[PDB]
Amino acid sequence: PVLTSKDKITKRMIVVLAMASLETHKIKYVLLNCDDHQGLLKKMGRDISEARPDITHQCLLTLLDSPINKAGKLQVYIQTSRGILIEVNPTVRIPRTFKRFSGLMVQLLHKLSIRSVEKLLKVIKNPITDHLPTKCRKVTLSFDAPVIRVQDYIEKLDDDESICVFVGAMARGKDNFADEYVDEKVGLSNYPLSASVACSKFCHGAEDAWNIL
Amino acid sequence: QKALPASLVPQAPPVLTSKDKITKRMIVVLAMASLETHKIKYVLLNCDDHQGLLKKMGRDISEARPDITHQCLLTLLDSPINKAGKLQVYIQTSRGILIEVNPTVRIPRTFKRFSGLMVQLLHKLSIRSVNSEEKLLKVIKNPITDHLPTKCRKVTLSFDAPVIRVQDYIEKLDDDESICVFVGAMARGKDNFADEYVDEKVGLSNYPLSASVACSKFCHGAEDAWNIL
Amino acid sequence: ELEQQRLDRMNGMIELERGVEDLDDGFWEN
Amino acid sequence: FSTSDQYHLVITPALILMSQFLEQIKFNSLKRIAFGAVLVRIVSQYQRISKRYIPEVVYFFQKILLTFIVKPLDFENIRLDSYELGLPLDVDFTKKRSTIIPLHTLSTMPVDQCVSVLLNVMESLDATISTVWKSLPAFNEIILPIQQLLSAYTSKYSDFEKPRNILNKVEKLTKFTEHIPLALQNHKPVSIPTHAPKYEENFNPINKMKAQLKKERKFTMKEIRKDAK
Amino acid sequence: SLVVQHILRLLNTNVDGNIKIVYALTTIKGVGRRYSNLVCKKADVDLHKRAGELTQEELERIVQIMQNPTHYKIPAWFLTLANNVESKLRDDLERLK
Amino acid sequence: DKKARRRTLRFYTSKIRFKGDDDIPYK
Amino acid sequence: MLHNPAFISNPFQTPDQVANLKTLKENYVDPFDVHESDPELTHALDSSLWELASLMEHYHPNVATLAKIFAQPFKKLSYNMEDFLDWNYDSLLNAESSRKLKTLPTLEFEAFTNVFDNEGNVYLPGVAW
RNA sequence: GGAUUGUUGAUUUUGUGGGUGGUGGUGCAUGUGAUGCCCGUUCUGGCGCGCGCUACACUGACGGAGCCAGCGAGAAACUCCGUCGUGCUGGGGAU
Structure with a gap:
C-alpha cells in the first residue's frame, strides 16, 4: 500500500529534509541556486552559501531510489528554510537532472500542488508533529553526538512505533533546527557525513534491520 | 599489559595509490561513463543540454548522461569508507578511457562545475590541486587489470544474478585480497561490459538499483564488515 | 531567551560572539 | 552581575582577588576566620550554577577545621597559622546556637562565638561536598583529607552530630561513584587529507598579445612569400 | 640515576634535530654547505654533531657568528611595446595589400 | 636565572579542510 | 596514566566483551600509595590523573583551558616553562585588567529581594547585616 | 528679543522614549472580507597536421682527482675517492 500521512498506525520510516533551501525568485520565478543566482540573492540579502537546493535533490534521489521506498515503508518530508513543509509521495519519480528538478519546485511552491493525470508533492500545514505517527521516536543527525549502530538502534526499538530522522540538508549550520520536536540526538559516524550519504547509510540499516533486502 | 603507542596524535591513513597493490581495499569501477567533449568552447555532452549535436554525431541521446557518473562519485567519495582511506574509484568511459580518481579529490557538488572538470580533465589528461601538490584526476593506460591489486576479487552488479548479502560476502572473502565492483553507470544496457575481466556476477537486491544507490549500499555493508564506522 | 544566553555564556560564549579559547592567545606569553 | 559566566569583567x-584572600590571609583570629567564613559563602554562590572548582575552598576548609581541634599529630601536611584557637573540651555541641555570622560582630571581636563560626564554615562544607566535589572525578582524593579531619571531630566530640551526618553523607557518595581509570585521549579518527581541484571554468583547448603576434606574423610571412613568388 | 646531557628553531626556521649540524643549517635560506661549515668551525662546534645534540651556548654562538658576520671577519663572498609592434606590423600588412 | 633561560627557549619555541557537503570555493 | 586503553568501550565490541569490561571496572582499585617515600615503589604508573581532570573545571577560564590540553592531542613538543613560572595573584589581576579584547558587562535576570539574610529571596543565606 | 524656512514665521531644530512592515502583492468566496498565503527617483558608462631538443633523480645530484678520439685548413660520456639522501629533496632552472 502507498503510505500516506493519514495512516498513523503502520510502522514507517519518516526522513525529514529539514531547512531546505528551495526558493523561487522572479526578476519569471525560478528556483534560486548558489551559483546561477549570486547577484540576485545579494539584492535579496541572503547568503549564497545557504542557497543550495542541489543538496536536497540528491537526498530525495537516494531516499526515493532506496530499496526501502520500493518496499512501501518510507516517507519523506521537506521543511523549507523559510518555514514551508512539503510531503513527498513515495510513488513520485523526481527528475534525475537538477534543471528539471528546479522547474518542478517553482511549480510546486506557487501552485501548492503537483498532480498527475493522489498528489505527488504537497505543501502542508506546519507543525510536522501532527503529520507524524502517534507513537513515534524522533532523532536527528549530530556529528558531536555519540556514534550508534543504526541496525542495533532500530532493532532495540519497538514494533508498533516509528522512527523519525531530521536530516539537515544545509552545507553548514548549527544542528538545532529540529531540537524543539526531537527527544534525543544521535551520531551515525565519527567522520562527518553528507546529507545524502548519512540517510543512504541510515536507510541501508533499516533494510537490514527489517530484512527488506 | 601491552605497551601503548608512542604518539596518540591522529594521523590521516595513507592515501592509497595504484602503485600500491598489497593493501586490502575496495575498488569500484564505474564502467561505461558517458563522458564526451565537443566544441560548440568544448562542453561535456549531456542528454538534455545537447540533443541536436549528438544526433549530428549519430549517437543516441538516451545514453548521454554524465549526471549518473557524477552522482556515483559524490556518494562514493563522500562515503565514510573514503574518509578511512580504503577505497578508490576507476571510471571506464564508454569511448574506452580509463580514469583514476584520487581518494582525496573533491568533485564539485554542482553538476555544471563537474562538467567543467571533465572537459578540463579529458583535454589536458590530468587535474592538479589548487595548492599544486598532488594529481587528483589522472587518466591511466588500459587495460584496467594491470592497475588493480595483484590479489583481488572481481564482481559485477547484475539484476539477474542471485541476490547476496554484501556483508556476508566480504566477511567470507580473504583478508590480503581486495574486492572489485564494476558498477554500471550506464542508464540501460546489457551487463557484460566487465565480463572479460570479472570472474562472477552477483545481485545486490531483488528490485532494480540505481548505480548511485547500489554502490552506496555495497560500501555501507563493507564498513559493517571491516568495522570502518 | 535570557536563559539560553546564560547557558551559552556558562559554556564559554563571550560577548564582545567569540569564545573563551580566544582569550588565551598570548596571555601566558606576557 | 551574572556570576555564572566563564569570563566576566x-x-x-x-x-581572583577573592580566592587570594581564602589562601593568603592567615586566618589566625576569630574575626579573621569569620571573615573567611563569609568569603566562602559568596564564592559558593558565585558558582551556584557554574559549579566550578575553587582549590582555595579546599585549602581554607582544611586549616580552619584543624585550627579548632589543636595539633593531633596526624595531619602534618596542613599549614596552621594559630594553635591557640583550639576549642575547649567542655563545649556542649548540643545547644541550638545561631550559625548566622553578623558582620557587625566582626568589628567587636568567646567559646560560643568560636563554635558558631565553626558551624557556618562547617555547613558550607556539606553544601560543597553535596554539590561541587561530588561531580568532580577526583572527589575521593579531594575529600580524603577532609574525611580524616572530621573523624577527629566525631572521636573528640561524640555528641557533635554535624560531622557524623556529613561523614555518613561522604560515605554514601563514595559508594555510588565508580572510580574508574580516566579516559580522555580517545580521539575521533581523522579523515584522509582533502584538496580541491584546480582548473579553468571555460576551458581553452601580455600572454594573449604575444600569441596574436605569433599567429599573424606567420600569416604575414606566408603571404609575402607567395606574393613575392 | 641522575645523568643530564628532535627539532629546533633557529633563525625562525625549523631544523630537524636528526640532521647533521652543518647540513641541518644548510636548510636555512642564505646558508650554504661551505658557509655552514665555516660557521660551525668559528663556533667551535665540532661538525659531526646532530642539530639536536647541540647545547644552548653552542646555538647562541652560532647565532652570534651569523648575525654579526663582519664582526667575526667572515669573508665578503659568503655574505604596451607588444601592442606597438602589433600596430606597426598591422600597418605593414595594410600597406602590402 | 630567568633571563638566562629566557634566552635559551626562544630557539626551542617554534612560531606558528572541507567537511560534509562543503563545496569548493567559487570564482 | 592519562588514559588506560583497556577501559574504552567500543560500539562493535561483542556482548561478552561488554560483560568482561564491566567486571574490570568493578574490581579496579587505585594502587598509588601517598605515604611511600621511595618514588620507585609508589605504584603511580598503574594509577591515573583524575586530579588533572578536576582542574579542567577550575574557576579561572585560562587555567581551565591549560588543563584541557590533556584532553587534546599532544601536537606540541614542549612548553616554554619560563612563560609559566613567575605568576602571582597580583600578576593575574593585572593581566585581567590589561586584556587584549574587551567584553560587554552582563547582568543577572534573577532577582534577590535581600542581599543578606535576616537575623522573600535571600542572596547570601547564613550571613546577616 | 526669532525654533526654523526660502526673506519666513512656530510649519521646524535639538535630547530622551517610542508605534508602526503597506501609493505590497498573489489567489479565495456576490464590489465587499478585524479575506488565506507570504513579502522607488534621476542620471553616468559598458587553429590543424607535424619534427627536434630539456626534465620528472640514488644506475642519481654535488666537491675533488684521473684521463682516452677522429673528421676537418681562402671533448664528453667516462673511472677512483668523498658529501647528500626518498622529503617536489642538495632533481627541475622558467619568472
Missing part, C-alpha cells in the same frame, strides 16, 4: 577579577 567584574566577577573574574573579583573571584
Whole structure:
C-alpha cells in the first residue's frame, strides 16, 4: 500500500529534509541556486552559501531510489528554510537532472500542488508533529553526538512505533533546527557525513534491520 | 599489559595509490561513463543540454548522461569508507578511457562545475590541486587489470544474478585480497561490459538499483564488515 | 531567551560572539 | 552581575582577588576566620550554577577545621597559622546556637562565638561536598583529607552530630561513584587529507598579445612569400 | 640515576634535530654547505654533531657568528611595446595589400 | 636565572579542510 | 596514566566483551600509595590523573583551558616553562585588567529581594547585616 | 528679543522614549472580507597536421682527482675517492 500521512498506525520510516533551501525568485520565478543566482540573492540579502537546493535533490534521489521506498515503508518530508513543509509521495519519480528538478519546485511552491493525470508533492500545514505517527521516536543527525549502530538502534526499538530522522540538508549550520520536536540526538559516524550519504547509510540499516533486502 | 603507542596524535591513513597493490581495499569501477567533449568552447555532452549535436554525431541521446557518473562519485567519495582511506574509484568511459580518481579529490557538488572538470580533465589528461601538490584526476593506460591489486576479487552488479548479502560476502572473502565492483553507470544496457575481466556476477537486491544507490549500499555493508564506522 | 544566553555564556560564549579559547592567545606569553 | 559566566569583567577579577584572600590571609583570629567564613559563602554562590572548582575552598576548609581541634599529630601536611584557637573540651555541641555570622560582630571581636563560626564554615562544607566535589572525578582524593579531619571531630566530640551526618553523607557518595581509570585521549579518527581541484571554468583547448603576434606574423610571412613568388 | 646531557628553531626556521649540524643549517635560506661549515668551525662546534645534540651556548654562538658576520671577519663572498609592434606590423600588412 | 633561560627557549619555541557537503570555493 | 586503553568501550565490541569490561571496572582499585617515600615503589604508573581532570573545571577560564590540553592531542613538543613560572595573584589581576579584547558587562535576570539574610529571596543565606 | 524656512514665521531644530512592515502583492468566496498565503527617483558608462631538443633523480645530484678520439685548413660520456639522501629533496632552472 502507498503510505500516506493519514495512516498513523503502520510502522514507517519518516526522513525529514529539514531547512531546505528551495526558493523561487522572479526578476519569471525560478528556483534560486548558489551559483546561477549570486547577484540576485545579494539584492535579496541572503547568503549564497545557504542557497543550495542541489543538496536536497540528491537526498530525495537516494531516499526515493532506496530499496526501502520500493518496499512501501518510507516517507519523506521537506521543511523549507523559510518555514514551508512539503510531503513527498513515495510513488513520485523526481527528475534525475537538477534543471528539471528546479522547474518542478517553482511549480510546486506557487501552485501548492503537483498532480498527475493522489498528489505527488504537497505543501502542508506546519507543525510536522501532527503529520507524524502517534507513537513515534524522533532523532536527528549530530556529528558531536555519540556514534550508534543504526541496525542495533532500530532493532532495540519497538514494533508498533516509528522512527523519525531530521536530516539537515544545509552545507553548514548549527544542528538545532529540529531540537524543539526531537527527544534525543544521535551520531551515525565519527567522520562527518553528507546529507545524502548519512540517510543512504541510515536507510541501508533499516533494510537490514527489517530484512527488506 | 601491552605497551601503548608512542604518539596518540591522529594521523590521516595513507592515501592509497595504484602503485600500491598489497593493501586490502575496495575498488569500484564505474564502467561505461558517458563522458564526451565537443566544441560548440568544448562542453561535456549531456542528454538534455545537447540533443541536436549528438544526433549530428549519430549517437543516441538516451545514453548521454554524465549526471549518473557524477552522482556515483559524490556518494562514493563522500562515503565514510573514503574518509578511512580504503577505497578508490576507476571510471571506464564508454569511448574506452580509463580514469583514476584520487581518494582525496573533491568533485564539485554542482553538476555544471563537474562538467567543467571533465572537459578540463579529458583535454589536458590530468587535474592538479589548487595548492599544486598532488594529481587528483589522472587518466591511466588500459587495460584496467594491470592497475588493480595483484590479489583481488572481481564482481559485477547484475539484476539477474542471485541476490547476496554484501556483508556476508566480504566477511567470507580473504583478508590480503581486495574486492572489485564494476558498477554500471550506464542508464540501460546489457551487463557484460566487465565480463572479460570479472570472474562472477552477483545481485545486490531483488528490485532494480540505481548505480548511485547500489554502490552506496555495497560500501555501507563493507564498513559493517571491516568495522570502518 | 535570557536563559539560553546564560547557558551559552556558562559554556564559554563571550560577548564582545567569540569564545573563551580566544582569550588565551598570548596571555601566558606576557 | 551574572556570576555564572566563564569570563566576566567584574566577577573574574573579583573571584581572583577573592580566592587570594581564602589562601593568603592567615586566618589566625576569630574575626579573621569569620571573615573567611563569609568569603566562602559568596564564592559558593558565585558558582551556584557554574559549579566550578575553587582549590582555595579546599585549602581554607582544611586549616580552619584543624585550627579548632589543636595539633593531633596526624595531619602534618596542613599549614596552621594559630594553635591557640583550639576549642575547649567542655563545649556542649548540643545547644541550638545561631550559625548566622553578623558582620557587625566582626568589628567587636568567646567559646560560643568560636563554635558558631565553626558551624557556618562547617555547613558550607556539606553544601560543597553535596554539590561541587561530588561531580568532580577526583572527589575521593579531594575529600580524603577532609574525611580524616572530621573523624577527629566525631572521636573528640561524640555528641557533635554535624560531622557524623556529613561523614555518613561522604560515605554514601563514595559508594555510588565508580572510580574508574580516566579516559580522555580517545580521539575521533581523522579523515584522509582533502584538496580541491584546480582548473579553468571555460576551458581553452601580455600572454594573449604575444600569441596574436605569433599567429599573424606567420600569416604575414606566408603571404609575402607567395606574393613575392 | 641522575645523568643530564628532535627539532629546533633557529633563525625562525625549523631544523630537524636528526640532521647533521652543518647540513641541518644548510636548510636555512642564505646558508650554504661551505658557509655552514665555516660557521660551525668559528663556533667551535665540532661538525659531526646532530642539530639536536647541540647545547644552548653552542646555538647562541652560532647565532652570534651569523648575525654579526663582519664582526667575526667572515669573508665578503659568503655574505604596451607588444601592442606597438602589433600596430606597426598591422600597418605593414595594410600597406602590402 | 630567568633571563638566562629566557634566552635559551626562544630557539626551542617554534612560531606558528572541507567537511560534509562543503563545496569548493567559487570564482 | 592519562588514559588506560583497556577501559574504552567500543560500539562493535561483542556482548561478552561488554560483560568482561564491566567486571574490570568493578574490581579496579587505585594502587598509588601517598605515604611511600621511595618514588620507585609508589605504584603511580598503574594509577591515573583524575586530579588533572578536576582542574579542567577550575574557576579561572585560562587555567581551565591549560588543563584541557590533556584532553587534546599532544601536537606540541614542549612548553616554554619560563612563560609559566613567575605568576602571582597580583600578576593575574593585572593581566585581567590589561586584556587584549574587551567584553560587554552582563547582568543577572534573577532577582534577590535581600542581599543578606535576616537575623522573600535571600542572596547570601547564613550571613546577616 | 526669532525654533526654523526660502526673506519666513512656530510649519521646524535639538535630547530622551517610542508605534508602526503597506501609493505590497498573489489567489479565495456576490464590489465587499478585524479575506488565506507570504513579502522607488534621476542620471553616468559598458587553429590543424607535424619534427627536434630539456626534465620528472640514488644506475642519481654535488666537491675533488684521473684521463682516452677522429673528421676537418681562402671533448664528453667516462673511472677512483668523498658529501647528500626518498622529503617536489642538495632533481627541475622558467619568472
